[PDB]
Amino acid sequence: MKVGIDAGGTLIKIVQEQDNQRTFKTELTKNIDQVVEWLNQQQIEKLCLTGGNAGVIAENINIPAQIFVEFDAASQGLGILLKEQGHDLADYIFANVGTGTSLHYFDGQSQRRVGGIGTGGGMIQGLGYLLSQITDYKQLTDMAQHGDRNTIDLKVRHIYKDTEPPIPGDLTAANFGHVLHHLDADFTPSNKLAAVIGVVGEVVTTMAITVAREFKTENIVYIGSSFHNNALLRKVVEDYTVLRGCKPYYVENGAFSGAIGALYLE
Amino acid sequence: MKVGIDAGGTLIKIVQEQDNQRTFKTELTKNIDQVVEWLNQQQIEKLCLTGGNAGVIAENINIPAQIFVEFDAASQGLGILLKEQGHDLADYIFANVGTGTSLHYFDGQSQRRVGGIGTGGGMIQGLGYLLSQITDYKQLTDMAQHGDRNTIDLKVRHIYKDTEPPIPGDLTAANFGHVLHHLDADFTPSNKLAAVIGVVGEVVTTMAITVAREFKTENIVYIGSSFHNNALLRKVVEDYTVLRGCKPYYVENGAFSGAIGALYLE
Ligand SMILES: Nc1ncnc2c1ncn2[C@@H]1O[C@H](COP(=O)(O)OP(=O)(O)O)[C@@H](O)[C@H]1O
Ligand SMILES: Nc1ncnc2c1ncn2[C@@H]1O[C@H](COP(=O)(O)OP(=O)(O)O)[C@@H](O)[C@H]1O
Numbered sequence: 460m461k462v463g464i465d466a467g468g469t470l471i472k473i474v475q476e477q478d479n480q481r482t483f484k485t486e487l488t489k490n491i492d493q494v495v496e497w498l499n500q501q502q503i504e505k506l507c508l509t510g511g512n513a514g515v516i517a518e519n520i521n522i523p524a525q526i527f528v529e530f531d532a533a534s535q536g537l538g539i540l541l542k543e544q545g546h547d548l549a550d551y552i553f554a555n556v557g558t559g560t561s562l563h564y565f566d567g568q569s570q571r572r573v574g575g576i577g578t579g580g581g582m583i584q585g586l587g588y589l590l591s592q593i594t595d596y597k598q599l600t601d602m603a604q605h606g607d608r609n610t611i612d613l614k615v616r617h618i619y620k621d622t623e624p625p626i627p628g629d630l631t632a633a634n635f636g637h638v639l640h641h642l643d644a645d646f647t648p649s650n651k652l653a654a655v656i657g658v659v660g661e662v663v664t665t666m667a668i669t670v671a672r673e674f675k676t677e678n679i680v681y682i683g684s685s686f687h688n689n690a691l692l693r694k695v696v697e698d699y700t701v702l703r704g705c706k707p708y709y710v711e712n713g714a715f716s717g718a719i720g721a722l723y724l725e
Numbered sequence: 726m727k728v729g730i731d732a733g734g735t736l737i738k739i740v741q742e743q744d745n746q747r748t749f750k751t752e753l754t755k756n757i758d759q760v761v762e763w764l765n766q767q768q769i770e771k772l773c774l775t776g777g778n779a780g781v782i783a784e785n786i787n788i789p790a791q792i793f794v795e796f797d798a799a800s801q802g803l804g805i806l807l808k809e810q811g812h813d814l815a816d817y818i819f820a821n822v823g824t825g826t827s828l829h830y831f832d833g834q835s836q837r838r839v840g841g842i843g844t845g846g847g848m849i850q851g852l853g854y855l856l857s858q859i860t861d862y863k864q865l866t867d868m869a870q871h872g873d874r875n876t877i878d879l880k881v882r883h884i885y886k887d888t889e890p891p892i893p894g895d896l897t898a899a900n901f902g903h904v905l906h907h908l909d910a911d912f913t914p915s916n917k918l919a920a921v922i923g924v925v926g927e928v929v930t931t932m933a934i935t936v937a938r939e940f941k942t943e944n945i946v947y948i949g950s951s952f953h954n955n956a957l958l959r960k961v962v963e964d965y966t967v968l969r970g971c972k973p974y975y976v977e978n979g980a981f982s983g984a985i986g987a988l989y990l991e
């Protein structure tokens with residue numbers, strides 16, 4: 460078997476390839492020792508690593524590994540997934556929403572990094588925890604899905620009260636900007652968590668559509684494990700991309716783009 | 726006298742012109758009815774209005790008043806203030822960090838809005854409240870200046886463990902992404918507030934830098950009352966502007982750009 464691993468700041472994504480069939484697995488970066496132990500017990504023909512904690516795995520295993528830069532690895536693997544899933548895009552932005560957010564322009568031949576921002580999965584977990592005291596990712600994200608943001612976020616139309624606004628009134632004008640106007644509301648964990656996901660999705664999308672405009676592409680492909688178990692995040696992003704005149708794409712197994720690409724770069 | 730008013734989502738900015746001298750006053754948008762009463766008791770030659778709550782004032786005043794779109798008003802007043810303060814910039818991005826944030830490219834001729842984001846002053850206040858229970862703006866911002874974000878924010882160097890990172894290791898990788906590693910004790914109000922101001926600052930600046938690259942200018946001017954009593958925010962924005970090879974500017978009374986511009990446009 461051939462193994463590709465993208466060892467990031469929160470998750471270790473593992474791709475196993477045998478007989479032209481891929482198997483996908485994830486482990487927490489906190490349990491990196493278990494991944495090492497498991498690798499030391501495998502019969503492996505090729506081991507390709509990428510991401511922040513590639514170095515740590517390679518240092519601790521008893522077998523040789525190849526390490527690749529995650530930006531190129533993610534690009535290569537995403538290219539493979541797009542074609543497998545019926546997309547023939549000439550060029551695109553891709554936004555890698557991992558522990559944090561890295562933005563890339565793929566021109567049809569190669570990628571260049573065009574942007575980044577700390578609003579990502581790590582903020583969702585960290586700021587979610589501060590507002591809710593929930594540490595378990597699945598519970599945290601589930602709790603957000605039917606939150607109501609209306610008592611928390613201020614829209615353009617709330618500022619332009621009795622005045623035609625110069626931009627769409629339904630737009631979020633200020634994340635959390637309605638809180639001081641609703642101090643009698645119960646700021647429930649669901650409502651608060653929905654607002655967290657909202658600010659993260661809005662910021663990621665705003666950066667992505669801005670670089671899409673800059674680099675003259677309408678296509679924006681969103682990857683990263685931050686979209687797992689978070690339909691609300693997918694909706695916030697997808698809705699606002701379309702409203703900004705761009706075409707959003709999600710790919711099955713997109714969070715494994717780096718792990719797949721690591722194997723192909725080798 | 727002549728009066729320019731920028732009636733925003735949080736503050737009403739009032740400029741009075743008389744005997745070649747201008748006077749600045751601020752009131753809370755909460756208390757707009759007092760502003761209207763005051764206006765109706767003054768002897769005003771010309772009244773010029775802008776901002777989301779211009780309509781409210783305009784409806785309840787007993788004299789004519791001209792109304793202007795705040796993007797043009799803000800651009801005009803900013804240009805006046807810049808020139809008054811010995812800045813002759815051929816072109817610039819300006820970022821209006823009000824209750825929310827609006828981004829503009831001023832090419833020399835005029836302004837165009839090139840983006841916006843709900844990360845601004847309303848977020849600082851509302852998320853600040855959710856994390857500290859503090860409603861007093863002065864108290865809230867004062868508390869934040871003594872905060873440390875080291876225990877809350879994750880840097881690139883934390884993700885690339887014992888390994889040379891692909892982008893500068895000191896950059897914030899994930900805002901609040903360090904929280905889950907520091908759960909043994911409670912997080913202090915000053916640290917949480919510093920982190921809130923940190924993420925608002927970084928988002929605003931990252932967006933400003935990106936559109937500055939897009940529209941081929943190295944100058945970024947920042948205005949808005951969000952900078953009032955908030956040295957931390959001024960600093961976060963300045964440092965990252967310079968880091969990305971751009972030139973940050975702030976003007977004295979920049980929060981009054983819109984009010985001053987309304988006067989000039991009439
Ligand atoms: N099972 C999970 N446990 C923890 N976080 C998860 C899980 N599934 C998805 N996530 C989300 O995905 C983010 C990590 O995204 P990912 O692209 O895997 O980043 P990295 O390469 O930095 O680990 C987390 O911050 C979190 O928001
Ligand atoms: N005295 C104050 N009261 C409330 N907010 C203040 C005060 N002084 C400064 N601010 C900050 O300025 C922000 C509003 O900035 P401003 O440019 O006046 O926006 P707007 O035109 O929408 O009122 C507030 O969200 C807050 O962060």
Ligand SMILES: CCCCCNC(=O)CCNC(=O)[C@H](O)C(C)(C)COP(=O)(O)O
Nearest residue numbers: 467468557558559560561575576897898927
């Ligand atoms: C001082 C302002 C900081 C804003 C700029 N910050 C950045 O560009 C880093 C944003 N984060 C990222 O690009 C990713 O988190 C990166 C460091 C590539 C690690 O990938 P991942 O493990 O997927 O989070």
Ligand SMILES: CCCCCNC(=O)CCNC(=O)[C@H](O)C(C)(C)COP(=O)(O)O
Nearest residue numbers: 631632661733734823824825826827841842
């Ligand atoms: C659904 C995603 C929303 C993100 C994009 N949102 C925006 O561009 C609106 C950001 N806010 C603003 O531009 C300002 O708050 C505006 C509505 C012009 C009012 O100015 P101000 O009174 O200074 O806040």
